[PDB]
Amino acid sequence: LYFQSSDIAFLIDGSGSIIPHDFRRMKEFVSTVMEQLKKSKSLFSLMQYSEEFRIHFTFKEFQNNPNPRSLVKPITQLLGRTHTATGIRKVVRELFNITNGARKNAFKILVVITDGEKFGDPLGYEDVIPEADREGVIRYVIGVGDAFRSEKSRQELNTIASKPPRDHVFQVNNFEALKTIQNQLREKIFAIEGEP
Numbered sequence: 001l002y003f004q005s006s007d008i009a010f011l012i013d014g015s016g017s018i019i020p021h022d023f024r025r026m027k028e029f030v031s032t033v034m035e036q037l038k039k040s041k042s043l044f045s046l047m048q049y050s051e052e053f054r055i056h057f058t059f060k061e062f063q064n065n066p067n068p069r070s071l072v073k074p075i076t077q078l079l080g081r082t083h084t085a086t087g088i089r090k091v092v093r094e095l096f097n098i099t100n101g102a103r104k105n106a107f108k109i110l111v112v113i114t115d116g117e118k119f120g121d122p123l124g125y126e127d128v129i130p131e132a133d134r135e136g137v138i139r140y141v142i143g144v145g146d147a148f149r150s151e152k153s154r155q156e157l158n159t160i161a162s163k164p165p166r167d168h169v170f171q172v173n174n175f176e177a178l179k180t181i182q183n184q185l186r187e188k189i190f191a192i193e194g195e196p
């Protein structure tokens with residue numbers, strides 16, 4: 001009925017493991033989800049990670065130009081390896097930061113989209129998940145493709161995701177299938193911020 005203030009961050013894998021066709025599908029998914037979630041008091045922020053980290057837009061930048069598709073469409077793929085834990089650290093320290101437009105008292109939600117296991121990262125999940133919990137970041141994770149077929153591999157999604165992991169993890173077989181979880185992700189976020 002009424003939507004409370006939420007600072008919603010996306011952290012998207014830009015590893016060379018993602019072919020250009022699939023990077024474009026991820027960009028369309030982030031664009032569409034941000035359009036569907038856009039409510040009066042909602043700000044968005046986007047970081048791409050590989051072995052490098054790019055802030056495409058802060059919450060303050062989104063407040064100044066609240067047009068998700070215009071902000072996401074021009075993004076170029078970083079390529080390289082998959083430093084998912086350092087990505088989560090930079091989201092918590094850099095995006096959820098008053099100086100970058102994050103708001104006191106808003107919900108803090110992160111959506112991670114990963115195509116593969118963490119590799120090359122000097123940080124473990126044990127170095128970054130406690131701080132994300134301390135800062136109150138609700139983490140949804142989307143594991144795309146065959147990387148996430150095995151139980152061992154799904155444990156990494158459970159490690160990223162907020163508890164209970166079954167309510168915060170999505171797995172899709174490929175990037176074209178990202179559209180199939182748009183409604184579920186929207187309804188979970190609206191259940192957090194919606195006050196009847």
Ligand SMILES: [Cl-]
Nearest residue numbers: 015081082119
């Ligand atoms: Cl990698």
